Amino acid sequence: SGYGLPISQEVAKELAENARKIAAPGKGILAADESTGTIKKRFDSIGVENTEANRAFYRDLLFSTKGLGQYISGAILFEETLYQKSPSGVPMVDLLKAEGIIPGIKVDKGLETLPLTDDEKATMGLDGLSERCKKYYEAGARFAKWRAVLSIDPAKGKPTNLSITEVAHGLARYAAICQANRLVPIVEPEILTDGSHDITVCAEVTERVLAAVFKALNDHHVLLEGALLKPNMVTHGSDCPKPASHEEIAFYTVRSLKRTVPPALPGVMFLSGGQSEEDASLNLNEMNKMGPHPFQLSFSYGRALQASCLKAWKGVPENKAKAQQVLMERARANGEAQLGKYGGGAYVY
Amino acid sequence: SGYGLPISQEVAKELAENARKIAAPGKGILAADESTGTIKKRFDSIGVENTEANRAFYRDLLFSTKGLGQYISGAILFEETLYQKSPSGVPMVDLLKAEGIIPGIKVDKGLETLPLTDDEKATMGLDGLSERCKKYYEAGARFAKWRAVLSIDPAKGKPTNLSITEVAHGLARYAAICQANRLVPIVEPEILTDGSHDITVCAEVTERVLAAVFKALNDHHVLLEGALLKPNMVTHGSDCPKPASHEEIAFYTVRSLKRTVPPALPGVMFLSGGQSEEDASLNLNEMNKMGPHPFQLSFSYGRALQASCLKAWKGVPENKAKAQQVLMERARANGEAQLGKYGGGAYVY
Amino acid sequence: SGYGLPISQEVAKELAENARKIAAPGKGILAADESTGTIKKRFDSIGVENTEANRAFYRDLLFSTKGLGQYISGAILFEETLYQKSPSGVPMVDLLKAEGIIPGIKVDKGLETLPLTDDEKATMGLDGLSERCKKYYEAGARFAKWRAVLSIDPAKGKPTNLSITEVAHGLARYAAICQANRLVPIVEPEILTDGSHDITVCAEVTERVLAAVFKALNDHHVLLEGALLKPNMVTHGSDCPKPASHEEIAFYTVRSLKRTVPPALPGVMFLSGGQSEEDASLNLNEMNKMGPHPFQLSFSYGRALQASCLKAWKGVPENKAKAQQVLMERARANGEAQLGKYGGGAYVY
Amino acid sequence: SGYGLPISQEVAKELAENARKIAAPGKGILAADESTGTIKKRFDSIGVENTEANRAFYRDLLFSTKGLGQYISGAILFEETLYQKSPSGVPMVDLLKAEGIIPGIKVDKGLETLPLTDDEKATMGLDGLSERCKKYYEAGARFAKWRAVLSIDPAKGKPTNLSITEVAHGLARYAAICQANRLVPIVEPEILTDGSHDITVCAEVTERVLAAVFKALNDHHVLLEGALLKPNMVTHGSDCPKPASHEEIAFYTVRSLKRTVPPALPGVMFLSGGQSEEDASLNLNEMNKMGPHPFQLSFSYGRALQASCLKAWKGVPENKAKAQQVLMERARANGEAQLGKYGGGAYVY
């Protein structure tokens, strides 16, 4: 013998069914799982102090947007928010349920430097993860998220073998623990845009990473039918003075995925990773003009769904409606991009 | 740096174009590349002595079948045949060209036991391979084939890690050498049916092997767009008294491929591996009733295309026509199976 | 680039110096790091309820044994004990320091089943490990311990690839984190004796595991000069009716280590793993009759140093002296075994 | 199950016994296995045309040196020479036997670029290797040699993962095939000195390579007791204007070996790799001043044993005696260096 025991068919069915619901046509994920420190930065942008009350107000503003569920299949939550009530006393999860949005929960405990690397990062959080997953399921979560980070630096040989090995190991362990507890795992191996590297460099690294990730997922007996991928798009580095064309980004991104991602995976939900709201919509749209694809190409956007929303809000309560309006504009934009039907707003081997 | 140099776009284009031609809808591969010893066994079945003249007569009988190219996109040849003339003096390759059938060449040098394994096999042939590929291209070949073999034996822990590692390493090296010489590599990791194991055991092993193979292909910078896979179907062991249903075989085979094979690969061309001619047609057909698929599911059949052909021939020259007729019946059967339109002849996680 | 940054020479020096102190000739480790649940079992053997007071009494009994430091270079502590005072109010660490015994700290958070394995175990504890190490160093600890566990079961293919991969990954991460915080890591990949397998089976598995472990240590930039190995001895399974001869155990154990352990490692400190006190002494002694060795072969014994000590104590305070006497008898026995000079008490390829 | 079958104890004994004979104290290997093209270069240095007669004359000059066997335990031969007779009609092997020098045979078929690498090399020769080994054993050979080559180029990320993986795979396959045929395999993963890299860079790469090599040897069931390592010394790059001190080279070389080479290996026989004759002697000597070591540190020198010999010969027959004299001077020099008793001639973590 020596292979993986059979997964529970009942569990597997649930996972696969929820994965497909999350990767529904014309829909994608709202990533609102900013940790206390990450949300601080977001609020700093608009001059708002990071109070529990303000966070509760803002997350309520997002999830109580009437009709949001037309374009948003799931919303990733930070632990605080999962157990939080809106200023009016409605549980955040109940707001989600009312729009038919599936709650998801971020479950990693952040980044820690790998000893004797040049500030390359391991993702922590496996300790107690299985128990946390059980509690989170009971609280209403049906999918999870775990963020690993890799840097490109040709001069420094980044990402190093150790980085890739660690990222893949952590993601596989996390994914398998999640599925054991009936949670669909979002696998997020984010290759940062930092640097002045070319898009073809990003393509090469993305391919190497994903090849490593999916081998590890297989090694750890992860059910691809009941999982999702949240990868970077393939782009120039953020220091490159010329943002690649949307066609170019679409071509290399799709290429990189098709070269590495087995098609049993139901959905690829891109992180926006610093892209403007409009680039993130156009790039996705351009990919889905190239369909049909073996898996759903959609979105799991944080900044690219909230940037204008935050700036419309400004911390002013009376700006709630206008803020919710702009969130809808962008949710609709990206839902349409999923179908390759977004008009726009305000082979290489 | 440290990544693979860019492939020649001109070479890549050729490979990708020829791979897609081979995996054309409604068409598949005739595997007529039996070595001298393997063809002996085939001829023994029908009481024919293995002479060069008889081999030339038989291969001519196959390739000169009028209208064969309607269902056969490519034909795998043994070296002898590639440089051989029909009894009438027509080069074998010219017969192929006349039907628009792409010539392919088997390039491995057979099997050798891995030291200190229980008769597990390495595939030999890398030495001189690159030079052979150049000559073969010039002779008209545009794709190649390399057969690796794995056994299932739960009691003996077969296939062992060493077996899988060796198979994958050899296949990747061979594939990359082929593409460097403008030949599309057929990657054949055959898991033998030997034993009384269940279909679910075959599924598990097939998944492990293919995961290992495609990781290795990626490591060796193989262009999936310009390659083909020739895997076993997922079936019960040959000693199991109950042949699995065609639906069951179709389901687990497709599942195993979708769980491991990135969709940039243009085609999966199944070996028939001992299956009757009709099972091989029905099983393929059942898979393509489940389409559309991310890659072409087709055939690269040896025995399942020739079994009745040989028995109709019997070594009798005057039986040439009848023999060619039956080959057409089966070529048509499998071409139709490719499209899921074969009528028949005479979710589990 | 892409390799590991240079370790701090000052840190490295400290680690290497302390590793050599721990693996001092004629000395070894007292493993007194039983968790709350493990010590319960030990106390159950002698009918003593697991109170904090009784644990403090017992650990004091051990560490306050006059002259213990002659044979004991280091003592592994559970967190509780590291921050604990004897019944008389003397800090446990001060008892150790008074005998010149180096304090060590167990830092793993125990075992958790790997999903979809047959109850194979991952070791948890990386989360927060680096911070814990800093605190532990400040409390006086200079080395750490992390226990991974593997099972042999030929019928079930245990240990599986996933088990070995996980064990090695966890050990390497833990080791590197430890060294970053100036703590010598004891690497403990314990292959359980459970089962009726032969000693030659144990030898094969031990070799495979250690090969995997030391490759991983190298991958993670662990300094072998500043680390220690705590492996199982190579023995028959615990269900085998015939305990192997001490010569046999010595031969295969040494063989397995020399086949896999690079000699920059200063010390191999065996776990006793269920062996009687006398077998553990005789087996070690027999190994060091075969010296000189490329590394120190010594002991890190829990049960094999305390078994008679506990039974002499019986929870009776007045039995303290007698209990301390027997601990000395065994500490001396194993110190002498380290030098191959123990008299006894009451080539295969 | 799933592990390696037991090696033949009779075969293993022979291999281990011959490995120890080759790595005898005060002795080392004469590497006279230059291929036709490599010997051309050597002869070009002294203005001698590469005729079969001249090659036979020169190899006779080497092996017929009276008393050579005092310092030379084995001599590596090219196939031609193994089946060659001296100008006087004495078989080359009989000259060796007369001095009690063990014949060895180079068995690789040279280097071939790995596709899509920057001219990184695979070693070819596995095809037919097992059969060649049988013939070579019968001809008198008792050990074999296989040369793999790696380059250091930080800017190009050399050696790449593919290079290391290939080198290790080829060496392991070759080693296991050799032992199956009763031949001790010399494992030669030569890291070229090309470049201006530092000695610490060489140390890091050497460690990575050897870690990979010995993991692969273990995976392929190679008997370390019956094998030898032929590694580069750890030195500055050949373009560095400052040759490292002999102490420095000795320290880092020993360090790199002790960090990666399990001590069951009987001998490390260094290649001279472009070093002057005197540096090669002094560097080895300096290492053996640091003894005792867990394995024999000795030599397998080609150029560093023949450089002056060739220049003394000049192709002039009458210079045979003088040429043989200088070969003895150097054989004695390196034999003494093996024991750390060579006078000279004309901790960092």
UniProtKB/Swiss-Prot annotation, chains A, B, C, D:
Keywords of the record: Actin-binding, Cytoplasm, Glycolysis, Lyase, Schiff base
Result of knocking out the encoding gene: Conditional knockdown results in growth defects. Decreased intracellular ATP levels. Decreased number of trails produced during parasite motility. Decreased ability of parasites to attach to and invade host cells.
EC number: 4.1.2.13
BP GO annotations: glycolytic process
Annotated binding of dihydroxyacetone phosphate, by residue: D33, K145, K230, S272, G273, G302, R303
GO-annotated cellular components: cytoplasm
InterPro entries: Aldolase_I_AS, Aldolase_TIM, FBA_I
SUPFAM superfamilies associated with the record: Aldolase (SSF51569)
Active-site positions on this chain: E188 (proton acceptor), K230 (schiff-base intermediate with dihydroxyacetone phosphate)
Annotated metabolic or biological route of this protein: Carbohydrate degradation; glycolysis; D-glyceraldehyde 3-phosphate and glycerone phosphate from D-glucose: step 4/4
Consequence of changing R42D: Abolishes enzymatic activity. Reduces MIC2 binding
Binding site for D-glyceraldehyde 3-phosphate: S35, T38, K106, E188
Entry keyword Thylakoid: no
pH effects: Optimum pH is 6.0-8.0.
Domain of life according to the entry: Eukaryota
Enzyme class: lyase
Catalytic activities: beta-D-fructose 1,6-bisphosphate = D-glyceraldehyde 3-phosphate + dihydroxyacetone phosphate
Family: Belongs to the class I fructose-bisphosphate aldolase family.
Functional note: Plays a key role in glycolysis by catalyzing the cleavage of fructose 1,6-bisphosphate into dihydroxyacetone phosphate and glyceraldehyde 3-phosphate. Forms a bridge between cell surface adhesins and the actin cytoskeleton. Required for parasite invasion of host cells.
Subunit text: Homotetramer. Component of a complex, at least composed of ald-1, microneme protein MIC2 and ACT1. Interacts with microneme protein MIC2 (via cytoplasmic tail). Interacts with ACT1 (F-actin).
Protein name: Fructose-bisphosphate aldolase 1
Organism: Toxoplasma gondii
